[PDB]
Amino acid sequence: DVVMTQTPLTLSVTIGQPASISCKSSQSLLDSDGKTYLNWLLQRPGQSPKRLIYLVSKLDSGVPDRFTGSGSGTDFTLKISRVEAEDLGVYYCWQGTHFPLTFGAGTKLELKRADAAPTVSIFPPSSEQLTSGGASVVCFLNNFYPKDINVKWKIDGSERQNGVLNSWTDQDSKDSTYSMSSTLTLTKDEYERHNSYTCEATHKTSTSPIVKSFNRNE
Amino acid sequence: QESCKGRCTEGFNVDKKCQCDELCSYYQSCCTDYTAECKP
Amino acid sequence: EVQLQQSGPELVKTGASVKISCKASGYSFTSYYMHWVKQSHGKSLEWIGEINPYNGGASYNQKIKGRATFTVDTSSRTAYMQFNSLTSEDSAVYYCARSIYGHSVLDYWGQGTSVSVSSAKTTPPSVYPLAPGSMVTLGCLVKGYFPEPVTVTWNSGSLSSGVHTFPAVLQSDLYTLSSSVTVPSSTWPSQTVTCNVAHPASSTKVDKKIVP
Amino acid sequence: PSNCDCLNGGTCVSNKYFSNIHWCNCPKKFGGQHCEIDKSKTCYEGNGHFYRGKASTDTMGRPCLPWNSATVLQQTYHAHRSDALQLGLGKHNYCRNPDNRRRPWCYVQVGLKPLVQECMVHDCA
Amino acid sequence: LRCMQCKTNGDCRVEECALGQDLCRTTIVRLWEEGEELELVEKSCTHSEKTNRTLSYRTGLKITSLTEVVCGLDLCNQGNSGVTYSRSRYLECISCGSSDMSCERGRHQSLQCRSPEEQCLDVVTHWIQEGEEGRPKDDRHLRGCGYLPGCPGSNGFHNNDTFHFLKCCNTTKCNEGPILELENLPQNGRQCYSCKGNSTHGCSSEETFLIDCRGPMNQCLVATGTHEPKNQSYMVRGCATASMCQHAHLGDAFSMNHIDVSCCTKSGCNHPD
Ligand SMILES: *[C@@H]1O[C@H](CO)[C@@H](O[C@@H]2O[C@H](CO)[C@@H](O)[C@H](O)[C@H]2NC(C)=O)[C@H](O)[C@H]1NC(C)=O
Ligand SMILES: *[C@@H]1O[C@H](CO)[C@@H](O)[C@H](O)[C@H]1NC(C)=O
For residue A18, is the peptide bond before it cis, meaning its omega torsion is within 30 degrees of 0?
Answer: no
Assess whether A60 and A129 both reside in one domain: no
* E264 contact partners, CB below 8 Å, separation of at least 6: A33, E219, E220, E270
Backbone angles phi, psi at A134, to 5 degrees: -95, 150
Q: Determine if ligand 1 sits within 6 Å of the CB of residue E187.
A: no
Write the CA distances from B11 to A3, B7, B14, E87, E166, integer angstroms.
79, 9, 10, 19, 32
Residue E231 beta carbon below 6 angstroms from any ligand 1 atom: yes
Q: Compute CA C23 distance to the chain's CA centroid, rounded to the nearest angstrom.
A: 15
E170 lines ligand 1 (CB under 6 A): no
Length of chain D: 125
* Contact in structure between D44 and D54 (CB atoms under 8 Å): no
**Cα–Cα distance for residue pair C179/C158, rounded to 1 Å:** 15
Looking at the 3D structure of chain A, how many domains does it have? 2
Question: Does any ligand 1 atom lie closer than 6 A to the CB of residue E201?
Answer: yes
CA E59 to centroid of ligand 1, rounded, Å: 39
What is the SS3 assignment for chain C? Answer: CCEEEECCCEEECCCCCEECCEEEECCCHHHCCEEEEEEECCCEEEEEEEEECCCCEECCCHHHCCCEECCEECCCCEECCEECCCCHHHCEEEECEECCCCCCCCCCECCCCEEEECCCCCECCEEECCCCCCEEECCEEEEEEECCCCEEEECCCCECCCCEEEEEEEECCEEEEEEECEEECCCCCCCCCEEEEEEHHHCEEEEEECCC
Question: Which of these, E79, E98, E75, E81, lies nearest to E14 by C-alpha position?
Answer: E75
Count the domains in chain E.
Answer: 3
CA E264 to chain A, closest CA, distance in angstroms equals 8
From E149, E4, E27, E10, select the one nearest E73 (Cα to Cα): E4
Residues A138 and A178 in one domain: yes
Q: Which of E81, E149, E86 is nearest to E119 (CA)?
A: E149
A77 C-beta neighbours (distance < 10 Å), count: 14
Tell if the CB–CB gap between E35 and B29 is shorter than 8 Å: no
Range of the domain at B30: 1-40
E66: chain D residues, CB-CB within 8 Å: 15, 17-18
Among A203, A205, A200, A209, smallest CA distance to A147 is for A203
Q: Which fold has domain C120-212?
A: Immunoglobulin-like (2.60.40)
Q: Which domains does chain D have, with CATH numbers?
A: 1-42 (2.10.25.10), 43-125 (2.40.20.10)
SS3 E272: coil
Report the nearest atom of ligand 1 relative to the CA of E227.
Answer: 28
Q: Which of D105, D104, D77, D102 is nearest to D89 (CA)?
A: D77
Residues E102 and E134 in one domain: yes
E137/chain D closest Cα distance in angstroms: 5
| Residue A79 domain boundaries | 1-113
CA geometry: angle at D18 spanning D13 and D20, to 5°? 45
Are residues A96 and A26 located together in one domain of the fold? yes
User: What resolution (Å)?
Assistant: 4.5
Closest in C31, C55, C102 to E209, CB measured: C31
Which E-chain residues 199-218 have CB contacts (< 8 A) with chain C?
205-206, 208-210, 212
Q: Where is the domain boundary, A51, A85, A113?
A: A113
Residue D15 distance to chain E (closest CA, Å): 5
Asked if residue A53 and residue A76 are part of one domain, the reply reads yes
**Exp. method:** X-ray
- Work out which ligand 1 atom sits closest to the CA atom of E201: 5
CA pair distance A179, A55, nearest whole angstrom: 37
Q: d(Cα E164, Cα E166) in Å, to the nearest integer? A: 7
Distance between CA atoms of E191 and E193, rounded to whole angstroms? 7
Centroid of ligand 1 to alpha carbon of E236 (angstroms)? 17
Structure letter (DSSP) for residue E3: E
Query: Based on the domain organization, do E78 and E97 belong to the same domain?
Result: no
Q: What b/e sequence results for D56-88 when a residue is b if at least 16 CB atoms lie within 10 Å of its CB, and e otherwise?
A: bbbeeebbbbbbbbeebeebebbbbeeebbebb
Q: Does D119 touch chain E (CB under 8 A)?
A: no
The continuous run of DSSP H or E covering B26 comes out as helix B24-27
Question: Over the Cα atoms of chain E, what is R_g?
Answer: 19
From E195, E199, E201, mutation site for ligand 1 pocket: most ligand atoms within 8 A of C-beta: E201
Chains in touch with B (3+ beta-carbon pairs under 8 Å) read E
A121 and A81 housed in the same domain: no
Other CB atoms within 10 Å distance of the CB of residue C70: 24
Could you tell me if C97 and C33 are in contact, meaning their C-beta atoms sit under 8 angstroms apart? no
**Selection from E177, E193, E186 nearest residue E141 by Cα:** E177
Residues A60 and A139 in one domain: no
Give the Cα separation of C94 and C45 in Å (integer). Answer: 10
- Alpha carbon dihedral B19, B22, B26, B28, in 10-degree steps, equals 40
- Rounded-to-integer distance, Cα C59 and Cα C74, Å: 19
The CB-based long-range contact list for D26-31 (8 Å cut-off, 24+ gap) reads D31/E36, D31/E38
C-beta of residue A170 within 8 angstroms of C-beta of residue A90 = no
**A150: buried, middle or exposed (CB in 10 Å: 19+, 13-18, 0-12)?**
exposed
- Listed by start position, the domains of chain C span 1-119, 120-212
- Contact assessment for residue A140 and residue C178, using Cβ atoms and an 8 Å cutoff: yes
Burial category of D4 from C-beta neighbours within 10 Å (exposed 0-12, middle 13-18, buried 19 and up): middle
Nearest to A140 by CA among C155, C194, C196, C177: C177
E53 phi/psi in degrees, rounded to 5:
-160, 150
State the DSSP code for E53: B
In a shared domain, residues E119 and E153: yes
Contact C27 E209 (CB under 8 A): yes
Chains E, B in contact, 3 or more Cβ pairs below 8 Å: yes
Rounded to the nearest angstrom, the minimum Cα separation between C42 and chain A is: 11
Q: Are residues E127 and E168 in the same domain?
A: yes
Q: Is the CB of E202 inside a 6 Å radius of any atom of ligand 1?
A: yes
Q: Give nearest CA residue, ligand 1 atom 27.
A: E231
> Where a domain ends, among A51, A78, A113?
A113
Q: What number of CA atoms fall less than 13 Å from residue D28's CA on the CB side?
A: 1
- Residue A80, domain CATH: 2.60.40.10
CA distance C157 to E127: 56
Instruction: Quote the CA–CA distance of C83 and C113 in Å, as a whole number.
Output: 13
| Cβ pair E46, D19 in contact under 8 A | yes
Which CATH code fits C1-119? Answer: 2.60.40.10
HSE-up (13 A, CA, CB side) for residue E238: 22
Q: Is the bond preceding residue A8 a cis peptide, omega within 30 degrees?
A: yes
CA distances (Å), origin D10, targets A179, D20, D54: 82, 18, 19
Alpha helices in chain E (DSSP H): 242-245, 250-253
Query: Could you tell me how many helices (H) and strands (E) chain E has, helices first?
Result: 2, 18
Structural domain range at position E141: 86-185
Expressed in angstroms and rounded, the spacing between residue E170 Cα and the centre of ligand 2 is 6
Q: Are residues A8 and A108 in the same domain?
A: yes
Taking the CA of residue A82 and the nearest CA in chain C, the distance in Å comes to 24
Phi, psi of A16 (to 5 degrees): 60, 5
Angle E42-E44-E50 (CA atoms, 0-180°, nearest 5)? 100
Residue of E nearest to A58 (CA): E273
Give the distance between the most distant pair of CA atoms in chain D.
Answer: 51
Residues A96 and A167 in one domain: no
Q: Touching check for A191 and chain C: CB below 8 Å? A: no
Ligand 1 in reach of E184 Cβ (< 6 A): no
Domain boundary pick from A98, A113, A128: A113
Does residue E90 share a domain with residue E76? no
Q: What is the DSSP secondary-structure string of chain D? A: ---SS--TT-EEEE-STTTT-EEEE--TTEESTTS-EES--SSB-GGGSS--S-----TT------TTSHHHHTSSS-SSSTTGGGGT-SS----B--S--SS-EEE---SSS--EEEPP--B--
* b/e A38-62 (16+ beta carbons within 10 angstroms → b): bbbbbbbeeebbbbbbbbbeebbee
Report yes or no: D84 at the E interface, CB cutoff 8 Å.
Answer: yes
Identify the domain boundary among E53, E85, E117.
Answer: E85
Q: Are strands C10-12 and C114-117 parallel, antiparallel or unpaired?
A: parallel
